[PDB]
Amino acid sequence: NHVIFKKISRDKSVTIYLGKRDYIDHVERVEPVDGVVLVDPELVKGKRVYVSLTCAFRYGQEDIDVMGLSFRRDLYFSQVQVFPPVATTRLQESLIKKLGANTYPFLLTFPDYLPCSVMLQPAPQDVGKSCGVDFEIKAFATHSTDVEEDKIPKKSSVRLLIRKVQHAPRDMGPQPRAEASWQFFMSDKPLRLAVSLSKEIYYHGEPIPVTVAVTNSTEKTVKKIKVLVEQVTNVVLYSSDYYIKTVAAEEAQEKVPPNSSLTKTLTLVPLLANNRERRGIALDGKIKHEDTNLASSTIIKEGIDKTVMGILVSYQIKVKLTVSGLTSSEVATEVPFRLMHPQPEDDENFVFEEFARQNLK
């Protein structure tokens, strides 16, 4: 029972139908956008209907008694003609049959140099403004005087805010543990801290087994071991904004006394759910929407300037050790890992629905 998403123009001349709201990027390639446009042939007589896929980075928010700063960079734009009619998919053939002979198909493909859906609304403490990477499917009708005069009337247009969602690639090699070790000499006795994860890539919702191995050869005591999942966000267009936020924390009060060692495996799950405060964090949608999660790890492709990603999202495990004196010292170290959605898979009946996403409040 396939749920199809429809939206209709104001003047009811153009209606657009999509198979999905969210389109999978599995690194190797990206799911193309196959849909259909249903035209009212009376209202489109001597007109031309096109469909456009735009990816755009945006920056800046409305502010009272504060100067309005706005910025947009288009990162990809591609347009095709649906009407008049000039391979197909099963989804289209089926939707055409169901909807009539006024239904016309469109296929818009993503390239490999784009980021995935990333958004950020800042907290009061944060410097820097609202920014994000949107993806817009837009169907719209033009006259033959609308071409060559650059006119696209609003009532004849219909836009949809789809998501490019980051999934792990289908064939992956076996994953080496994400492991590092440090040696903090204190009076020329070493305090050795090793940190190790099971794998390099974790899935949203999947728990992360963090193995910590303190080897205290010092005369000092490790009073406290804290383990975090930090999300590091770097806005890399317009404004060099930097956010780092804990999205998961576990704090054992294990003591490692002088001339002893303690191995230990904490399990963290970095979730948007864990954060009442959803601001200052890179999400893959709006705070209000239900289907919105933490943004996946940015995957910069070989020889692609990172700045064309707009927002850079990375995750890391941070281990903090509190260490006694004879006040006290605190050392900390980071271990990077990638967080994305699980790898993808290998008549029909249609229930039609408004594209508008489900809120939580």
Ligand X SMILES: O=P(O)(O)O[C@@H]1[C@@H](OP(=O)(O)O)[C@H](OP(=O)(O)OP(=O)(O)O)[C@@H](OP(=O)(O)O)[C@H](OP(=O)(O)OP(=O)(O)O)[C@@H]1OP(=O)(O)O
Which residues contribute to the site for ligand X (CB under 6 A)? 62, 151, 153-155, 159, 161, 226, 228, 246, 249, 286, 288, 328-329, 355-357, 359
Query: Nearest distance from residue 237's CB to ligand X, in Å?
Result: 16
| CA–CA gap between residue 247 and residue 3 (Å, rounded) | 33
Beta carbon nearer to its own copies, 190 or 344: 190
Beta carbon nearer to its own copies, 111 or 342: 111
Query: Nearest distance from residue 155's CB to its own copies, in Å?
Result: 8
Query: Nearest distance from residue 93's CB to its own copies, in Å?
Result: 27
- Return all residues near 27 (Cβ < 8 A) that are at least 6 apart: 168, 169, 299
Query: Nearest distance from residue 72's CB to its own copies, in Å?
Result: 5
Candidate segments 34-42, 280-288, 299-307, 332-340, binder of its own copies by CB under 8 A: 332-340
- Site residues for its own copies, window 73-132 (CB under 8 A)? 73-77, 79, 125
Tokens representing residue 294 in the block? 């933490």
User: Considering only CA atoms, which of 178, 174, 222 is closest in space to residue 200?
Assistant: 178
Q: What is the DSSP letter of 10?
A: T
Binds 249: which of ligand X, its own copies, none (CB < 5-8 Å by kind):
ligand X
Candidate segments 27-35, 38-46, 185-193, 276-284, binder of its own copies by CB under 8 A: 185-193
User: Considering only CA atoms, which of 177, 222, 230 is closest in space to residue 201?
Assistant: 177
Residue 322 interacts with its own copies (CB under 8 A): yes or no: yes
Distances (CA, A) of 111 to 27, 51, 88, 157: 11, 17, 19, 25
| CA–CA gap between residue 178 and residue 197 (Å, rounded) | 5
> Contact 136/16 with Cβ under 8 angstroms?
no
Cβ neighbours, 10 Å, residue 314: 19
Residue 283 interacts with its own copies (CB under 8 A): yes or no: no
Query: Nearest distance from residue 293's CB to its own copies, in Å?
Result: 25
Tokens representing residue 96 in the block? 């055409």
Residue 265 interacts with its own copies (CB under 8 A): yes or no: yes
User: Considering only CA atoms, which of 48, 36, 75 is closest in space to residue 59?
Assistant: 75
Binds 357: which of ligand X, its own copies, none (CB < 5-8 Å by kind):
ligand X
Cβ neighbours, 10 Å, residue 96: 18
Beta carbon nearer to its own copies, 27 or 331: 331
Binds 70: which of ligand X, its own copies, none (CB < 5-8 Å by kind):
its own copies
Beta carbon nearer to its own copies, 74 or 345: 74
